[PDB]
């Protein structure tokens, strides 16, 4: 563990060493080479308990990576619903793009993560915003053949129009 960074501890879900390394030094929001916080590493590897612990101890969920990667997008991309809910409850932006033109919703749709798609839409993610190529989240779900996802999105759009 001496060899492991705080990021790696968070990724592995090593709560004990992680908690110790935080007392030793104020490193809770210390970014690695790519701008990733311990929280982003934890979110990316689905470590719910570590995410809870870091957020309780002041980890900032709005900090972004070098390419504007977010903890939210990392979690969405892998379908870690419980982590998505925790971050959303912190009031992060749900509609922001990174440099690779991805948004949380596009990553959820790309990974066929239906519960994540539903949760994002309920928190204000807009399925009509487009990539630089002109396609939106509905388009992508159709393109990829993810029918349960297409239906969640369409149902959402329809209910907006039906009030």
């Amino acid at each position: 563990a001496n060899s492991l960074s705080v990021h790696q501890l968070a990724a592995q879900g090593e709560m004990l060493y992680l908690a110790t390394r935080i007392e030793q030094e104020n490193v809770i929001n210390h970014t690695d080479e790519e701008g990733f916080t311990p929280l982003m590493w934890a979110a990316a590897h689905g470590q719910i308990a570590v995410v809870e612990f870091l957020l309780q101890n002041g980890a900032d969920p709005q900090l972004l990576g070098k390419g504007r990667e977010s903890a939210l997008s990392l979690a969405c991309s892998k379908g870690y619903t419980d982590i998505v809910k925790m971050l959303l409850d912190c009031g992060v932006d749900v509609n922001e793009y990174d440099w690779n033109g991805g948004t949380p919703l596009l990553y959820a749709v790309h990974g066929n993560h239906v519960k994540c798609v539903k949760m994002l839409l309920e928190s204000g993610a807009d399925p009509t915003i487009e990539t630089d190529s002109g396609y939106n989240s509905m388009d992508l779900a159709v393109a990829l053949g993810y029918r349960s996802v297409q239906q969640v999105i369409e149902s959402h759009l329809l209910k907006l129009l039906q009030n």
Binding site: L74, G102, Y107, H110, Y135, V142, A143
Partner: peptide, 13 residues
């Protein structure tokens, strides 16, 4: 690796 996000399509369609 640093965790990474998947590459999305540059066009669909």
């Amino acid at each position: 690796h640093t965790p990474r996000l998947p590459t999305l399509p540059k066009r669909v369609p």
